[PDB]
Amino acid sequence: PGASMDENYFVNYTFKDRSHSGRVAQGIMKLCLEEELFADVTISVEGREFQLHRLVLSAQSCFFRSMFTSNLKEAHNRVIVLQDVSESVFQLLVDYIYHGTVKLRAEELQEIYEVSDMYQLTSLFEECSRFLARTVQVGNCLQVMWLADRHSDPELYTAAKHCAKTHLAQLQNTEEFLHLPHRLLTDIISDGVPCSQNPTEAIEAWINFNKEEREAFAESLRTSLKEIGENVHIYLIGKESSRTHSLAVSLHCAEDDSISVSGQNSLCHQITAACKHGGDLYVVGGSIPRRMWKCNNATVDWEWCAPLPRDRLQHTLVSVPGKDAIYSLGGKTLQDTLSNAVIYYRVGDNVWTETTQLEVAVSGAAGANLNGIIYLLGGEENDLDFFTKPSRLIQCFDTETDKCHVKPYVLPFAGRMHAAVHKDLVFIVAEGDSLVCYNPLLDSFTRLCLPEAWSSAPSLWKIASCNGSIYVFRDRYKKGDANTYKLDPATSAVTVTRGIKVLLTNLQFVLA
Amino acid sequence: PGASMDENYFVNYTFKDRSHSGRVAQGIMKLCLEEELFADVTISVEGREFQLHRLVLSAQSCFFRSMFTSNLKEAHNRVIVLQDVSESVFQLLVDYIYHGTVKLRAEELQEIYEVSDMYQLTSLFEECSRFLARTVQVGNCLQVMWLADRHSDPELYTAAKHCAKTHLAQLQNTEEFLHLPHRLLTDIISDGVPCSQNPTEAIEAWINFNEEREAFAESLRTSLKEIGENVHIYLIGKESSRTHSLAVSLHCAEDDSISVSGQNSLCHQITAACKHGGDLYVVGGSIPRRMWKCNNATVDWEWCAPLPRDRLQHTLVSVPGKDAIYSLGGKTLQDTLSNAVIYYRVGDNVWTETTQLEVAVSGAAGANLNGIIYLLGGEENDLDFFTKPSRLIQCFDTETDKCHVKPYVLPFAGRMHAAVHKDLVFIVAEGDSLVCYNPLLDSFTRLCLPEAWSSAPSLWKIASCNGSIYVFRDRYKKGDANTYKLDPATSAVTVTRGIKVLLTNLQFVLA
């Protein structure tokens, strides 16, 4: 305020209180939401009589705002009937509107997606969309795709597209694929079908349904049939100690969930840290200065890349496709000093730079690359007495605006955990059998601990995610077969899957 | 956080978004306060018929909540009628329950005082009571007193007593005084009525009334305590004849019978001065650390402990809260500026230094309010050697010691003088630019005084006492003295009696 001759405090000024939001907005939280006292309309769903306010409904769902505001000849009654929603689904909806904690079931999940879009709740619809982006299986990604192009939700129509494009071979015989309109089929094929699924045969088998008139589209479909070559899934790099070598094998999952070896490339120098970027290794090791060797599935010959500045051991190498970069967060120097120097290697130009340092230095952490944010889980850190105490810190170093955003909560455990990104979640495996299902968006931990029957020894469990099903691996086994389990997160059922016959499983190693 | 295995993130969930504060709290303010909609209950005040929401009325009030809740034939009709409320006052309550701006005037201020207390409105009964504690003149010092002792408000009953016991002599002739209840008269007498107002005669008025009220003979006499008046204006100024600085003391009276008081004398020069209680603390001389404490009629200049950190042209304020003489800011002779504080006590004589300020300032003015110390105006220099005036206001907390700048600036800057008055902090700059401060409302107020009076630019000093602003003009061209009274209700500058002060210089004026 600068002036006004009329505002004279002794006769006439103008009151201006700054507590009109801390007493009216925050004030109306017990009279409306918690303790419903004054209710206006009675929405009726099936054979029920709900008592819902006319105020809080129009502040969230704009569709309800149009039905209440637009007074007409039918607005004289306070009983409003609904038709689309069921009796046991509207209650879940009215539980979200008032409180904000709706328990999302499994079977009644496609029903809180169709009705949550007509009411235009832009917060539940953006969460039921993420639910359908991670529960998609090989037999379900043909109705979900049809369910995403009708509501115009590109965050699901693309997440449910990389299920019928990487598994088109099995879908060939299915009766749902035969009725697929030409509009959707020109997107599944054009998205880069892998060669192993026979993309050129699905088109031919599909057009034989209505050859009387469907032959016109046959020529156009074969024009856009971009096929991407087959990659190898897990770069299991075996660090044998009996023989000075490193059998960097490349496991290749089959169609029926069977892993087979596809290369026995070897190196003589020691290994400090390893990372895979797309389809190639970028292992780090050797005597000083810290070198880098890059391998490939088909090359079967190690190349050479730009030397590592700031040589150190126990890195936390991560790799992103949303960023042609390979970071080197954390690590401790040769003099047992926990340093923090995030590096910004690029594959296009073999040159190193430096970026914003971490808030807290960690060594031997876990590298998770969920979304475009690099997550550092676990590790070790010395608090006061020069002694490395196993810490539990979740750092969130970014890649767009480089800054550290340490979360205000800690992990259930600590140590030398190994992470493996799966869909939106980030699975974690501790020094034992305590597999957690940490979610970076909801900030919750749902540890689905396996039965302690197979816990004879405190052996670390390596975890790898490939083809939409994580394969929790096993270290050196007591004179037997490696426990290459195939844990199914949906059912928490662990199944022993063999097919790998290697001699490096007798000793510890690194993974990718 | 955490969970257990009944929360399988593939088929189970507990989705809980911590964002029901911008979609249910912000989405309701614009649907109820700003854009009034979905009205259900109609309030039928006399003459008119308003429409109000059931959720906003019961969220700020309590009488309005315990009345809609009880449906004992009080909410089913929905044509409910309110009584003992005028048409105009209720419209200003809708303006307050809703968006939150009120236009409190003087015509309707007692009706909104009682009505806002009947409806249990909490925040409105903290500025409508501050208003009454701000405009109690002698003529209505008793209609407000009895109003205060009906709703149990100590912020007004203890503020309508300091302004109703000093003017006890004039209230004696008033008819309302003779009808005083026995309880009210007891408290106003036993608070230190000045000896010049004849406290003994006040009881004699009831004695000479002519029964039932005449039985009080020994009562109300043992509880009377008389103290001489000692709060007045201290004036500092050197005569043109000699360098002997004078400290003439004058006191204001309601009868305008100014009597010549003792003329205090002093030898050295003055750097700064403070007014605490009924004594004057003078700093200055050849060495700035000299503390020559003076008084009314003791002619004593006892030298106290010197200041450990010597400063020149600093600010002295008295916050009785801790019987302290806090010396905030200052100037250092070693090509730098001081930021320390030294509060010389009376029975302790301590030199403690607390936390410094946030923005450097020197040669400013200070005014104390309810313990909180405000530093306003002054000058600040920079490494660029630029004489940039400072328009930043500083607050010195009395409880948390959290000095911080305010998100605004004064309308002007330079060398100013400040003197509190009721709940306001008046500001006078170089010219006719009166500005009234208000820490609670965080707002200002000017008067737009024309410059036709200040022909020559000269410093103006302001002193406030007995609820009447006094403004003193400095450096007149050998003419009549200027003791303009600045009654802030309406601009009523009148020259008072021409006392022969004969001081053509004004160093400091303290009230």
Numbering used by the authors:
A (entry chain A): 7 to 518
B (entry chain B): 7 to 216, 218 to 518
Quote the authors verbatim:
By co-opting KBTBD4, a substrate receptor of the CUL3–RING E3 ubiquitin ligase (CRL3) complex, UM171 promotes the degradation of the LSD1–CoREST corepressor complex, thereby limiting haematopoietic stem cell attrition. KBTBD4 contains an N-terminal BTB domain, a central BACK domain and a C-terminal KELCH-repeat propeller domain. As expected, KBTBD4 forms a homodimer through its BTB domain, which is characterized by a domain-swapped two-stranded β-sheet (β1 and β5)34. The predicted CUL3-binding 3-box helices of the KBTBD4 BTB domain are extended by five short helices in the BACK domain, which is connected to the KELCH-repeat domain through a linker sequence.
For comparison purposes, we also determined the cryo-EM structure of KBTBD4 in its apo form at a resolution of 3.83 Å. Superposition analysis shows that each protomer in the free KBTBD4 dimer is largely identical to that of the LHC-bound form. However, the BTB N-terminal α1 helix in each protomer is tilted away from the BTB core, thereby flattening the V-shaped scaffold and further separating the two KELCH-repeat domains from one another (from around 9 Å to 30 Å). Thus, UM171-induced LHC binding involves significant conformational changes within the E3, which are accommodated by structural plasticity at the KBTBD4 dimer interface. A comparison between the free and LHC-bound forms of KBTBD4 further reveals an open-to-closed conformational change within the E3 homodimer, underscoring that the actions of glues can benefit from both local and global structural plasticity in E3s. Notably, UM171 binds to a pocket that is present only after KBTBD4-B–HDAC1 contact, suggesting that the surface of E3 scaffolds can be structurally plastic and might contain more binding sites for glue engagement than their apo structures reveal.
